[PDB]
Amino acid sequence: GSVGCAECPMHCKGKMAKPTCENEVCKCNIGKKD
C-alpha cells in the first residue's frame, strides 16, 4: 500500500508539487504525476 505517495505530495514544497510512486516508494518529482 503506497502511503508515502500520500505524504510525498503533502511533504512537497510550493512551486514544485507532483506525487511519484515506484514499487511502494514515493517522491515529489516532475515528469510523473501519481
Curated annotation (Swiss-Prot):
UniProt keywords, alphabetically: Disulfide bond, Ion channel impairing toxin, Neurotoxin, Potassium channel impairing toxin, Secreted, Toxin, Voltage-gated potassium channel impairing toxin
Domain of life of the source: Eukaryota
Note on domains (UniProt): Has the structural arrangement of an alpha-helix connected to a beta-sheet by disulfide bonds (CSalpha/beta).
Task of the protein: Blocker of human voltage-gated potassium channel Kv1.1/KCNA1.
Disulfide cysteine pairs (residue numbers): 5-21, 8-26, 12-28
Tissues where the protein occurs: Expressed by the venom gland.
InterPro entries tied to this protein: Scorpion_toxin-like_sf, Toxin_alpha-KTx_8/9
Pfam families the record matches: Toxin_6
GO cellular component, one term: extracellular region
GO MF, one annotated term: ion channel inhibitor activity
Subcellular compartments: Secreted
Family: Belongs to the short scorpion toxin superfamily. Potassium channel inhibitor family. Alpha-KTx 09 subfamily.
Record's protein name: Potassium channel toxin alpha-KTx 9.4
